[PDB]
Description:
flat, designed, de novo, tandem repeat protein, computationally designed, de novo protein
Amino acid sequence: KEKIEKLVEELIRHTEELRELLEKLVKHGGASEEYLLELLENLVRLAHVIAEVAREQGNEELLEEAARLAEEAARQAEELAREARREGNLELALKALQILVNAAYVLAEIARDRGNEELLEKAERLAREALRQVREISKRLQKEGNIELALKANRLLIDALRVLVRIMR
Amino acid sequence: KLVEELIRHTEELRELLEKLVKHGGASEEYLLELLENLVRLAHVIAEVAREQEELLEEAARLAEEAARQAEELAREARREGNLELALKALQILVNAAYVLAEIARDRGNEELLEKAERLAREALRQVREISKRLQKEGNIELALKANRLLIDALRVLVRIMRHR
Amino acid sequence: SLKEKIEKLVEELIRHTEELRELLEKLVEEYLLELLENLVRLAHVIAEVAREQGNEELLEEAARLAEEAARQAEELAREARREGNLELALKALQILVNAAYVLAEIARDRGNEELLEKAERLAREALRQVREISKRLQKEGNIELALKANRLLIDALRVLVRIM
């Protein structure tokens, strides 16, 4: 478990630097918003990976670090959805909520596994906003009659329901 | 909770899309993508019916309705020559079999396990028959992707065979 | 004879995939990689079938399919890294990294510390190769592939932790 705890540094160190290369190149007139979203999806995936390694080793210095990254990634995701919702890019908004819903499960998968109920409600708080937000977006997509984006909105409403069941069981 | 609103509302998206595919309004693939969402909802309901039978029966009625629509639509695309849509539609039946098995095998309905097992074998046979044609027609891109379906279809039989 | 009719269906898949292996190796580029991704999935499926029926010969066939994919994948990764085709190189390591999990899922259930020792080398070497391309891609002003290279390094670290 010595090198296994050490091997986590290479990914976390490279990712924290890789987040900056995309966080500074996206403020200039160059990079689009959607490329940063995939990085957020990459961040929550690392948070989930750190959670799966921390269960075997039981290192609380890594479960909390996965949650710190997960909460920071989910919080940034909600803002990007809010920013895109006024501009009319519905594909980007639904891509952001999918990131938020998945990030809630990582927070749940951690509180229930660790036992700390301090954040077990906070996963629901993120997930509750997504189900309400996508439902409002689904009706607008249903009203506009744009089926390609509307069909994708249904996938989020279904995938959000899977998270709600997992936080109770 | 919310599952009542979604099952009705998602079925409502099925009704608007079932008439636009019949009339000229909808390309078949857009109707196909909804089926993938339909089978996905049934599995979510199945995990809810365990942790929380009236929902298990609703998931099987809803899931089976997606599998039946897939086999019939697959036959139409198989006869028309559009093989890519036929292989994509046939996958929906394979995907629907796991939802039906996990819902029959965990509900004791032994007869429903016979219908779940039957669909994947026929789908695997149809996809195997579709796989052979793609090798002869020289279409390599669709043939290997069709092979991935036959491999992933075989996985369904093992999950329904080991648990028997 | 439960696993008797299943072992017949699995024989067809190993033969049909090996038959498709000759057609895709004879035309020669990325489509050959797609065969590896489709092939390694069969190795994991056959391994889960051999653990269920206890057939050791199916383990030998499952390891044969898995092991040849890692050798075929690593060579293209070295070739694709030098040709500038970095997207093709990243796909080869992704196929290479995923194939290592099949060896672990096999070795521990088969009990072979020689094959289990070699798997760790494959995932660790690939992770550094994915890391080395990530650093080189970071120097190139292309962020998009760096995102995909970064995702592999995350999944490469995930596989290495379980194989230990």
